[PDB]
Structures are given as C-alpha cells and as structure tokens.
Design a protein around this ligand. Structure first.
Ligand SMILES: *P(=O)(O)OCC(C)(C)[C@@H](O)C(=O)NCCC(=O)NCCS
Lengths: 895, 49, 82
C-alpha cells in the first residue's frame, strides 16, 4: 500500500479519538442534568407538584393564621415590642406533625423525638422517587446521592436540657446531617448523603452539588431537596425586632407596597440524573437543568445584606456554565423576598444581568413563588424550580400576587413582572435564584425537556398493594379518582406502571377483566372494601417455597386449551413440541384432539385423554415457568407424576410421551372391568369399610384427611355405593371405565413393563416428590418397576403433601385445565394448621388469556414473584400514577 | 380563672377528601334561582362522582 | 400455652418501648415482622433486654433484638434457656 493511504487510516483513528475525548470533556463539565421526578409539600393544602401548580395558577394566597396545636401561646405572643411579634399569619404546614412512622419502619418514640424536617423529607423523597417511574424499593444498593438543604430550626432545643421523652434520639433525630443520612439509610442508597447549611440558599446549592456529583460519575441518580419547619415561633420574634416581616404577612415581591417578608414552611425534593442516563433508561424527563453557579458577595454593606454585583456574577456564571446567551431564557423565578432592602437590589441585578440586549418584544418575565406561599427558607429554590418546571410543562407563566404596581426603586425602563398570567420556535428556558442571607448566592437555569407502541395485551391485571388494608383502600380510592380525571387512558399502560413502577407491599389486591366497564366499579368496591367478581385480595407471604401439582384424571373438559392455542404463542409452541414427541407413539395428532377437529377421538377413550392431559399439563407448567414462576418442587398423582417427571428434568419429553402413551394403551383392555369411587372419609375408616369385599376393592388414592378414592370391580363398586348410601356417606363415582391402582392391573403387568422399556432416567434438577414412596425420590430411580408400582400401588398424596409442607413449601400451583385436587390440598393445609395458599391455572369453560391472567394475579396476590415484564411487556408508555397513600399520625413534642 | 373559656377557630390542613357516591339530594331556595352557590355546588357534586 | 404467654409478654414490652407514652402499635408487632423492620436501635435493644430479663429473671446478651430479629424467634430463644 502507498504511504499516503497508510497514514490516512492513522489520521482517521487519531481524529476519531480526538472527537471522543472532546465529547468526554463536554459531558464531564457541561452535562445537562434531567429532572426525572419531584415532590413537594408547601402551605395551602399543596401535597403534590400538581397541587402546587393548581395553587399558583389559580392565584391562591396560601397564608393563614398561626397553628394552635403546636403549643404556641398565640393569643399572648401578638403585639403590634420586647419579645413579641406583629404578624398573626404566615405559610404553615398544619399537618407537619403528621407522619407515617410505620411505613418507613420508624418508631413513634423515634418519630416524636425526630425533627419534623426529617419526617417531611423522608415522605417527600419517597414520593419523588415514585413520581419518577422508579420503585424506591428497587433503588436499594444503587449509587444514588442525597443532597438536602436543611437547617437546625430547633425542635428538641439542645441548649435547654432536652426533654425526657426525646432522650437518646435528640442527636440522631435532630442533627441536620441525619436529615440527608436517614433517606439513604431507609432507602438503602449508596451515594453520598450530604446536608448543606446555607440559610435561604441551601436547597439550590444542594442541587448544584448533586449536579457536580452526577457529572463526575460519583452518582447514578441524586436527590436534591430542601426542608423548612417551625417548631417554635422564634423566627417571627427575632425578625420582628427589626422591621423585616411585613405587617400583614404578605410578601409583596417587587411591588411598590413592599414592606417586609413573611417566613413559611415547606419541603420540596427532586430526583435527578444525567440526561444521557435518563434517555438510556427510558425515564420521563420533566425538565433539564443545563447549568448552575454559586458564589459569595463578601464585601456587602453588613453581613446580612445583599449585593447586586454578586447576583449579576452568579447569574452570568450560570449562563456561561450552560453555554446559553442571556436572551435565551424568557422567565426568571426571582428570589423576591419582599423586603424593601432586598427587592430593588435583586431587580437591579436581574435587569443588569439578563435584560441588556433582548428583543424589543420579548421582555424577561419575573415572578416569585414567595408571593403565594411566603418565604419557604431553605426549601425556596427547590420549590421555585418546581414552579418553573410546571410552568414549562403547562406552557403558561402564573401571576405573582400582591403587585399593585412595580416598585419605583428600580428603573424598569427589558424586564417585566408577572402581574397576570402570560402564555408561551426554540425550547423554553427559565432561571431560578436562591440568594441567601449568609451571602451565598445561587442560580440555576432549566430548559424544556426534549421531545421523546406495542399491541395491548388483553385482560391486563391492575395491581395494587399497601402496608395495611386501610392504606390499600386509600390507594384504590386515589387511583379511582386519578383515573376519573383522564381522557380514556390505555389499560395496559396502567397495568405496566402499577406492576413495575410500584413496590409490592404486603396487603395486595388485583383487578383482572377484559372489558373497560367493570374496572371502575371494581376499584370502588376495593375502596369501600366490598367484594367484586373481577377483584382478588390477599396477604402475601414473606417466605415460602413454590410447588407445582400434577393431578391425574378428572381435570378434563372439551375445548380446553383451544383459546390458549390461538391467543398464547408460548402455549402453542409447547403443545407443538408435545405433539411432535407424541406422534411416533400414537396414531393421531394432539392439536386435532384439543381443537376438536372432525373425526378426532373424544376424551371418552382412556388412551387419548391421558396423553392429552399430560401434554396440556406440561405446556401449562412450562408457561408458568416462562412467566417467571420457577417451581421449588413438583408433585404428581398417578399419570400426572409422569408429567412431573418431565418438569423435574428426570425424563426427557420423548421418554415421558412414550411412558404415558404406552401405559394408557396397555391400560385399554381394563376398560369396563371396574372403576373408581371418591368418598369423603379418613383412610382408616375407608380401609375398614372395604374389609367385607376383600381383594375386590382397594384404596386407590388417599387425596386428603377426608377424601379417599377406592378402585375395584364394577359389581363390588356398586355394592359399596349402596352401602354408603345406606350409611349416608357422600360417595361419588368418577367417570372412568377402568380400575387403576387395583389388583386388576396385574393382568397387564408385563405390558406395563414394556411401556417404560428403553427410557433413560436422569437425576432431578427440581426436587421431585414421589406419591408412591412418600418422600423425595432420586431422578435415576424412575425405572419400569417404579411406573408399574405407580399404576398399581395406592397413591399417598396426603402423606407426601404433609411432608412437603413440613419442608417449608407454602405455594401450591395446580397446572391443570381445571382444579381437581385443590379441595384435598386445602383440607390438608387446614388440618395441619399451615398458611399455604392453593391456586389453579384454568377452570372448566374458562381457558382463555383472561383466566390465565386471573391465575397469575391470584398467585402474585398470594406473594409469588411473577415476571410481569413477560406478561405485559418490556416497556410501555409511561403513566403518572398517584403516589403512596400514607396513613399518617400526629407526632409532636409536648413541654 | 379556673372556670373561664371561649370559642376559637383552629386552622386545619385541607383534607384529601374522597369521591361522592350515589345520589346526593340538594335542596335550595327558589328565591336564589340559578345564581351563585347552588349551580356551583351542583356541578361540584357532579364532577365528584 | 407457655409460648403464647411469652409472645404476649414480648409483644407488650416491645410495644411499650416502641411508644413514647400511653394501642394501635400494640397489634403492629406481629410475630413475623423483624424488629429491625420496626426500627429498633441499640438503645431500644438494650431496653428490651433489660425488660425481658427482669420479667424472666434471666441475664441475656445485649443484642437480643437482631440475633433473633422476629419476635417469634425471641420467644423460641427464651423458651430454649428456660
Ligand atoms: P447500636 O450499635 O445501634 O449503637 C451503639 C453505638 C452507639 C456504639 C453505635 O451507634 C456506634 O457508635 N457505632 C460506631 C459508629 C462509629 O464508629 N463512627 C461514627 C462517628 S462517631
């Protein structure tokens, strides 16, 4: 090759690596962070970000009288001088003492001893994770950061000989570091838990630190939040000595009537991560924090004074960090404290920084959340970003209250205030400022999230769960209310969101129906707890090993598996494999028998029903395994054991097909000689009842403590039926013309030995329980003599079920076309006093996808883990479900 | 002073509430006719279920 | 009958320690729920140790709340050495 073409490839490699390194630099310094979730509790009844949006958009003024349950001497501490205050109303969280101690594992002792800042912050973080489409329980072990802007407002009062009740927990319950630490401890997060003390700027500084941590790869996701609560009214008294609080309590932000600043409570948290990570993981992006900046003023006229130069510098630094021109943003969530000193300085800083070269028809629209709820304090910036996020989402800037006129202290003649709401070529961008009293100015820039199907599975279960039944009812009511205000949501998307993006709690319920006319009433009946046809409820077991159960005959009905053959492709594939295995050892096809094709034999014949039952059971068990329910044990019943022997891995498909087909064919001559009769009695009573007939009859199967099947000759069977009718015993004759598990099979014994010849047994992968021996059996021992004994010796289903329950097994999934042994299994379970729950797959005249999903939902409600991804899908459109319905209780410290 | 009392109006948090069930019987004076509160509360119970 | 009484005593002591003062949380201590899941620390652990030892007159290890996290496990442990 020439030298030129040789060096060309090296140049190409070099420039590609150069581009890769430059892109690495760009994503390592100027990476856009994605706000994937948020959660706020602010005064005025606001509990969700949507509550905040409807509050601020409506122009509601969320300032009301002081709380009366906090022990304050509210009638006495009002004086419009020495140690009193001249304000009688501010933004308060009257439910600040309300907290769900049990949900997070916290004790009432620790809860009352714990700062309400931590109590609010835990719930806010949990809701923020839930609103991001993330399951908080699945966040355990992840490198998730926690950055909280909080402060020691004083709830236990360490300087005052902390009370006897909160003794021992006044460090853990009140250190400001533990406010961030407890989130990670409860949620199991691994990223750093750092709390920031910066007075009225801590939350936005925490967002800055979270952004820097995520950009450096120290975290995968992060919690950037703030909290403010007022255990004592000192913040009003200390700031009343200087005329800093407004006389009426309204934060007249940037208004000519600006005369002070009223404080307020509130918690506000964001769950954020890298934008590329959000796109890769398929999380919904609410907004994009492009850049951030923080600095100081230092040379301010007094320590607690502002500085226009510092505010301009941080604004310009934030703009440069995001790589955005000042004219790019068309809105600012100014601090807007309302002070006479602070407002003109902030307005001058905004005018100098942002509005200097903007077009003559797009002024910068300035507003403040403080006019609505008052000064939140630490949680001010992280609430302002929520306000701007929802303003971008709804495409309208809400009005800022109490602006009778723009303040005359600044020359507006570029920038205009949001006196009334205003509506909105290029992405929407907005700034937020969190200037503090300690001089730490902060500023962030947010941008509109960038613009981002599968067929609907029928009868998609809707899953609900909660820690307690009352919480479950609250969850159902909340979901019903949410679905009422929605124009025709997609039910499969709701099913996916409920199954995947919400924790499975203890008390569970499910709604399985294929029509969008019963789900509403079912949700209601769940809400008031009434029963419903398409509703299932239960208490999931913490631990327990799973069992597959394979009964013998009886679980047959025409058309079984017909609907599943069309609807379910996995079941069709398994039936096809069974048919291919069976073809060589029989003179017809399984699919024709199941589909009821013309001329195919019916289920009356013994030789065709048993292979059909085997194939259906094996296919159903494999479908269960495909849905993620891998058995911990398998048990059978007569011919069903062969199917169990296939699922355990001891017998290949060909060997099991050979055994079942040849065994049934060798059982054909027994037809008409005798039959079975099921009578409900103990084993000893049946045994001593069959004594006069001697060898004619025998105990065919001990299904349960009060359910035994006896097999024998037709004449003796009728004689015993008449005797039971005389004795008033509920004896039922099974529809079978052949007396299996009786002496008659000896007549065909050698032929049975021919049925199992040539097989290749293997050790069991899954522990198989032989109903003949009554305990686990090695897989290699399944020889011809074993199968002959299975056909001949009495089944001991009750004994092996008792032994299996003794081994910690707690779930019994019948893989039949219709439950036949569920009664006996439940009888044994209640006899031994265990908490095991029995389930079935299909039911008579019910074999479509709806019944399959009903069985799966019942199993999940009983506590069996189910891979809902396979049932529903890998990824559907995101759906915003309501957060957890906490059952709160009052927790406050008394003097 | 051990036998002095008064009545006050404690503020409380806006409860989450629930959904209106079945039918609710609203009775109104005909002097008001369709004015303010009656129409609005009728609508409120309408969208409340 | 002894196991039921011991479980009742353990539940009562755990509820009393778990509450700052003064029924809702008395039933919140089911035999299956782990004590750590109920939010128990070293302080409440040693308090339960002292209370159970005083009730049974037996010197127990200072971590008889996480070595046997379920209350039923604690009942089994008490019934063992008694
Ligand atoms: P228990 O184990 O919950 O509490 C007992 C303890 C107070 C000794 C324990 O909390 C503890 O101090 N563990 C070690 C903590 C440590 O080494 N450093 C943290 C900063 S002192």
């Amino acid at each position: 090759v020439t030298d030129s073409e040789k060096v060309a490839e090296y140049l190409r490699r070099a420039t590609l690596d150069l581009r890769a390194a430059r892109q690495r630099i760009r994503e390592l310094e100027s990476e856009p962070i994605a706000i994937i979730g948020m959660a706020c509790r602010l005064p005025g009844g606001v509990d969700s970000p949507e509550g905040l949006w409807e509050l601020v958009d409506s122009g509601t003024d969320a300032i009301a009288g002081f709380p009366l349950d906090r022990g304050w001497d509210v009638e006495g501490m009002y004086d419009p001088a020495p140690g009193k205050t001249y304000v009688k109303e501010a933004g308060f969280l009257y439910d600040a003492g309300e907290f769900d101690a049990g949900f997070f594992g916290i004790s009432p002792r620790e809860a009352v001893s714990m700062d309400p800042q931590q109590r609010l912050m835990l719930e806010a973080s949990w809701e923020a994770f839930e609103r991001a489409g993330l399951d908080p329980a699945r966040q355990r072990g992840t490198a998730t950061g926690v950055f909280v802007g909080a402060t020691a407002t004083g709830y236990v009062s360490p300087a005052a000989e902390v009370p006897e009740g909160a003794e021992g927990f006044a460090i853990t319950g009140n250190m400001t570091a533990v406010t961030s630490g407890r989130i990670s401890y409860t949620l199991g997060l691994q990223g750093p838990a750092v709390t920031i003390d910066t007075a009225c700027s801590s939350s936005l500084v925490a967002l800055h630190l979270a952004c820097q941590s995520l950009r450096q790869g120290e975290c995968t996701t992060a919690l950037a939040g703030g909290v403010t609560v007022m255990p004592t009214p000192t913040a009003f008294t200390e700031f009343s000595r200087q005329r800093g609080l407004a006389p009426d309590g309204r934060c007249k932000s940037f208004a000519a009537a600006a005369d002070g600043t009223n404080w307020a409570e509130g918690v506000a948290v964001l769950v954020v991560e890298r934008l590329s990570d959000a796109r890769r993981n398929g999380h919904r992006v609410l907004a994009v924090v492009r850049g951030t900046a923080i600095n100081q003023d230092g040379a301010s006229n007094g320590l607690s004074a502002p500085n226009d130069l510092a505010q301009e510098r941080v604004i310009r630094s934030a703009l440069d960090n995001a790589g955005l021109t000042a004219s790019d943003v068309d809105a600012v969530e100014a601090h807007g404290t309302g002070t006479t000193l602070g407002d003109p300085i902030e307005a001058q800083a905004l005018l100098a920084a942002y509005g200097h070269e903007r077009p003559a028809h797009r002024p910068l629209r300035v507003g403040s959340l403080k006019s609505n709820i008052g000064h939140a304090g630490p949680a001010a910036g992280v609430a302002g970003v929520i306000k701007m996020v929802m303003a971008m989402r709804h495409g309208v800037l809400p009005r800022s209250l109490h602006i009778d006129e723009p303040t005359p202290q600044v020359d507006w003649s570029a920038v205009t205030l949001l006196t009334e709401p205003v509506d909105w070529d290029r992405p929407r961008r907005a700034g937020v400022s969190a200037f503090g009293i300690s001089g730490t100015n902060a500023h962030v820039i947010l941008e509109q999230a960038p613009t981002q199907p599968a067929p609907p599975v029928p009868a998609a279960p809707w899953l609900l769960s909660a820690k307690t039944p009352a919480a479950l009812r609250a969850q159902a009511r909340r979901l019903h209310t949410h679905l009422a205000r929605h124009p025709h949501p997609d039910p499969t998307d709701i099913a996916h969101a409920l199954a995947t993006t919400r924790t499975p709690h203890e008390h569970r319920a499910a709604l399985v129906t294929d029509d969008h006319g019963t789900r509403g009433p079912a949700l209601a009946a769940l809400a008031e707890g009434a029963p419903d046809a398409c509703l299932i409820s239960g208490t999931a077991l913490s631990k327990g090993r799973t069992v597959f159960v394979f009964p013998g005959q009886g679980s047959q009905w025409t058309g079984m598996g017909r609907e599943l053959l069309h609807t379910s492709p996995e079941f069709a594939a398994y039936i096809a494999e069974c048919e291919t295995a069976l073809n060589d050892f029989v003179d017809w096809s399984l699919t024709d028998v199941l589909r009821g094709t013309e001329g195919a034999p019916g289920y009356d014949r013994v030789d065709v029903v048993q292979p059909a039952l085997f194939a259906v059971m094996v296919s159903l068990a494999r479908l269960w395994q495909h849905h993620g329910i891998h058995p911990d044990a398998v048990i059978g019943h007569s011919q069903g054991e062969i199917a169990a022997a296939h699922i355990a891995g001891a017998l290949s498909l060909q060997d099991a097909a050979r055994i079942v087909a040849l065994r049934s064919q060798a059982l054909l001559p027994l037809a008409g000689l005798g039959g079975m009769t099921s009578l409900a009695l103990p084993h000893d009573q049946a045994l001593q009842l069959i004594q006069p007939w001697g060898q004619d009859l025998s105990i065919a199967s001990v299904n349960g403590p009060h359910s035994t099947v006896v097999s024998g000759t037709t004449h003796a069977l009728d004689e015993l039926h008449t005797t039971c009718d005389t004795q008033g015993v509920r004896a039922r004759r099974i529809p079978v013309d052949y007396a299996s598990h009786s002496a008659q099979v000896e007549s065909i014994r050698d032929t049975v030995l021919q049925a199992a010849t040539g097989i290749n047994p293997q050790p069991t992968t899954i522990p198989l329980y032989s109903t003949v021996t009554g305990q686990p059996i090695d897989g290699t021992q399944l020889d011809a003599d074993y199968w002959y004994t299975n056909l001949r010796h009495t089944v001991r289903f009750e004994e092996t079920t008792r032994a299996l329950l003794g081994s910690g097994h707690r779930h019994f999934i019948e893989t039949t076309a219709h439950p036949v042994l569920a009664l006996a299994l439940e009888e044994t379970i209640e006899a031994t006093g265990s908490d095991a729950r029995v389930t079935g797959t299909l039911r008579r005249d019910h074999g479509d996808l709806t019944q399959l999903h009903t069985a799966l939902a019942t199993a999940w409600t009983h506590g069996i883990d189910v891979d809902w991804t396979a049932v529903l899908g890998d990824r559907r459109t995101p759906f915003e479900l309501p957060t957890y319905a906490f059952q709160r209780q009052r927790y406050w410290l008394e003097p | 002073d051990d036998l002095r009392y008064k009545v006050t109006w404690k503020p409380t948090a806006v409860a989450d509430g629930a959904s209106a069930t079945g039918t609710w019987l609203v009775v109104v004076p005909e002097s008001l006719a369709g004015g303010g509160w009656p129409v609005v509360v009728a609508r409120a119970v309408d969208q409340a279920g | 009958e002894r196991d039921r009484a011991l479980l009742e005593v353990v539940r009562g002591n755990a509820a009393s320690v778990m509450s700052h003062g003064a029924t809702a949380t008395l039933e919140a201590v089911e035999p299956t729920r782990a004590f750590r899941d109920l939010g128990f620390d070293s302080l409440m652990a040693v308090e339960l140790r002292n209370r159970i030892g005083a009730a049974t007159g037996l010197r127990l290890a200072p971590t008889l709340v996480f070595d046997h996290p379920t209350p039923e496990a604690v009942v089994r442990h008490l019934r063992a050495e008694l």
